């Protein structure tokens, strides 16, 4: 129970990671041979909702240490410096992804506030 908020939550989280990826594409829009990367939201979200390792974790003072598919973005208009970031594509994708992040924020807000309203 109360993992009924899981989906949107993880979905929102995935969008945020996507931003970084897309943001990197904008940052390296001038570097030679960047080969713009991206991930497909739907399949990645399905996989994560269906689903590093634990170290020596006896009593403290043993220093615990923690340990997605970045797909090519098929380009257009080759540019002789290997850079495949068609900045126009990335701008459109970034706008849409920011918008859908806002939507996810609103949906979690609504579910959480419905939960809180029932509880008072």
């Amino acid at each position: 129970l109360d993992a009924a908020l899981r989906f949107q939550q993880e979905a929102l989280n995935l969008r945020a990671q996507r931003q970084e990826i897309l943001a990197a594409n904008i940052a390296n829009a001038d570097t030679p041979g960047y080969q713009a990367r991206d991930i497909d939201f739907a399949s990645e979200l399905k996989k994560v909702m269906v689903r590093g390792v634990a170290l020596t974790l006896t009593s403290s003072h043993h220093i615990p240490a923690q340990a997605v598919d970045l797909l090519y973005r098929v380009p257009d208009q080759p540019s002789l410096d290997g850079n495949t970031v068609d900045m126009d594509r990335e701008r459109t994708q970034f706008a849409d992804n920011s918008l859908k992040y806002q939507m996810g924020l609103t949906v979690l807000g609504s579910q959480l506030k419905g939960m809180m309203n029932v509880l008072q």
């Binding site: 208009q77 080759p78 540019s79 002789l80």
Partner: protein
Amino acid sequence: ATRTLVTASTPGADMTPGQLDYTSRPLDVALQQDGWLVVQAADGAEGYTR
């Protein structure tokens, strides 16, 4: 493939014989068409001149 670049080039030299000034000097030499004087170049090699 929409982009194409516009590099410049010099495909060589114009082998069209310029026209002649009569200097009357005994050893001013004019070559006929497609003829070259041979010269020992700076490093030492047969360069060709007009």
